[PDB]
């Protein structure tokens, strides 16, 4: 009635995808935007992938002014295997080993499963997608 088009489309930061979400009694998790190969080719390099993980973890651990612990999902793709496709690259395995033992880049990283993280993680309840 008031000719309002709502929020225009914009790129979504890493600060918003970290927190969990609730849409119609369902749990959803969103991957970070820099593993998007359909926009640009700079994400096709494993070393660059490692450096973006490092800077993004540092930035996330820097401010974190919202309550609860963060949550990052890092899917492993077919493009991050070797040429033979039978083993992951050395950089990816090394990065996984570093993010184990609770010290990677400039932040403490703790590993586990989504089952344990659901009890201690911020959840945002969304209401405007409920049916009218």
């Amino acid at each position: 009635r008031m000719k309002l088009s709502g929020r225009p489309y914009r790129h979504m930061g890493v600060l918003g995808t970290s927190k969990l979400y609730d849409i119609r009694k369902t749990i959803f998790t969103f991957t970070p935007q820099f593993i998007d190969q359909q926009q640009f080719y700079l994400a096709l390099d494993n070393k660059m992938i490692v450096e973006m993980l490092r800077t993004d973890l540092s930035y996330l651990c820097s401010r974190w002014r919202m309550t609860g612990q963060p949550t990052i999902t890092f899917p492993i793709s077919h493009s991050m295997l070797d040429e033979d496709g039978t083993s992951l690259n050395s950089s990816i395995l090394a990065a996984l080993r570093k993010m184990q033992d609770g010290y990677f880049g400039g932040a403490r990283v703790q590993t586990g499963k989504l089952s344990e993280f659901l009890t201690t993680s911020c959840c945002t309840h969304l209401s405007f997608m409920d049916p009218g």
Binding site: T67, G68, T120, S121, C122
Partner: protein
């Protein structure tokens, strides 16, 4: 004496929800004791407030009201 149709919003006898109903909602307030305890609870997502942040309000034990009530009803002549 009131009729059966009037017993809806009387005081000290019947509730506002009707005689044959019990759906009262009660309020609770979460207040911590120490900064260490409140930060530890916040680490697990528990929200609680330290007593030093409620300065306009005061929290007192039950004996204060007892002594205040004891102060009342004093007469010197009798």
């Amino acid at each position: 004496y009131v009729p059966l149709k009037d017993q809806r919003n009387v005081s000290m006898r019947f509730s506002n929800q009707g005689p044959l109903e019990n759906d009262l909602v009660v309020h609770v307030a979460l207040i911590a004791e120490s900064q260490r305890l409140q930060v530890f609870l916040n680490t697990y997502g528990i929200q609680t407030q330290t007593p030093q942040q409620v300065e306009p309000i005061q929290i007192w034990p039950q004996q204060e009201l007892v002594k205040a009530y004891l102060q009342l009803g004093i007469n010197e002549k009798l």
